[PDB]
Write a protein that binds this ligand. Structure first.
Ligand code: CL
Ligand code: CL
Ligand code: CL
Ligand code: CL
Ligand code: CL
Lengths: 190, 192, 186
């Protein structure tokens, strides 16, 4: 049952900032019965904020869908770009609050792409984030401007989408152990 | 999913009551703590004690599975004229016979704050509760917060009660409680 | 989108050792507030590829695990347990591990005691696929019974109960991360 629980006339506006990459070490969780060298995860974060007309009495909207697009150079075929895609659906998105969305690449994805643990160079070649509310686009971020803005829509032989090098939501990473108020709850696979 | 056991075996489940506990999520210690440290908030943890018996008693001491259906009703915080009906199925596997154990479902801190308006909840924000237990697709036990004609309130078709998959009810393995209190509950069957 | 991202002429070879059972405690995770035995089936393996990929990795390998135990609810019958684990970004030329797990309650139900007793694992098998083709097979049996998981017989019954779990479906998910490749999510 995915119909709005809110005012069906409610409209939503989303302000996006930029997607930025942070290299973050995997937590070494301590245990009672007593240590590996932590590997480096790629953590892509984008600040956003939600407003609505009218404002929901609960102070939240049901859900927002984030679509992440990341392009990298194929490390096995150098004249080709790989396009990586991930949809993250958040639930109970607060209104009027500095919030963040995020997606991740594993240490082995980063090492395979770049050749070294933790990465090197500007290995992220293109970035994009599209936000949808009730199936309609309400915000777009891109690392490109003008004609190249929506690069993820460009059909070209030099860039191919792959499900390999999988993009992961926070609940698909070891950072799920760290509950932070700034990220909304992620809707589980249905 | 045919039974690995005697297909004529029947099962009886003794339920106690579903109780709500507000509980902080575990604050896990790490080698290099992050700055700032995570400040866990309070989850809604709905707990129901139960015990199983069977005829005849399975030689292994366990039954294959039991399905728990949870029904929770709250006031829609966005349209206070109506109630929201929240639903969750939890399929437990390897359920021991003759042993006190527990079933549970959860609401996140943001679901609780959205429903009640304050972090950690306030008031009697849970209006109705129900738990239905099935074995091999047959109802064997029912708990309800209501009596009389309102007992099976989750079967009432009404415009003032609306089911929603938002405010999602979570099973334990869908929460930060997954690896804790492991012996208190049976194993949960993963999504198929 | 599961076509290869590699050189399409690449040939992949996988060398398996043997599947072995370890009974292991779940991690006792320390928390700010206060500071049962799983079955852990482990199989070492190593990948080689010709030509060697520039990135040092292949896209994926699919591991199919087959485990047979005596049905504790009827002694004249075997239960066959099955699990597919798809690994991604599998390094080439590097000794690594694959694994599958049974919960404490599965082990206690099968054997009658926490932690297990006896040689309760009766048959084992691991089949590895690359791009949908079998590239390696391990079995606890040789001869006619080698591929015992393909034998149709009323004395062995497949069940999704006693579920086999991948590492990310267990409390071991965030530990020993360097020992195994990444697991592809559902
Ligand atoms: Cl920014
Ligand atoms: Cl950046
Ligand atoms: Cl009670
Ligand atoms: Cl209570
Ligand atoms: Cl062994």
């Amino acid at each position: 049952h995915m119909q709005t629980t809110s005012n069906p006339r409610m409209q939503v506006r989303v302000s996006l900032e930029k997607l930025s990459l942070y290299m973050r070490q995997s937590p070494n969780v301590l245990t009672q019965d007593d240590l590996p060298k932590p590997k480096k995860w790629a953590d892509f974060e984008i600040p956003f904020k939600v407003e609505a007309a009218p404002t929901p009495k609960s102070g939240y909207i049901d859900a927002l869908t984030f679509k992440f697009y990341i392009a990298v150079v194929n490390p096995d075929r150098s004249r080709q770009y790989l396009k990586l895609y991930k949809e993250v659906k958040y639930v109970n998105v607060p209104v009027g609050e500095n919030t963040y969305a995020s997606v991740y690449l594993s240490p082995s994805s980063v090492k395979r792409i770049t050749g070294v643990e933790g990465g090197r160079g500007k290995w992220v070649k293109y970035q994009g984030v599209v936000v949808e509310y009730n199936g309609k686009i309400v915000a777009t971020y891109s690392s490109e401007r003008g004609k190249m803005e929506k690069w993820w829509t460009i059909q070209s032989p030099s860039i191919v989408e792959t499900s390999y090098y999988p993009l992961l939501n926070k609940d698909e990473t070891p950072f799920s152990v760290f509950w932070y108020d700034r990220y909304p709850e992620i809707m589980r696979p249905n």
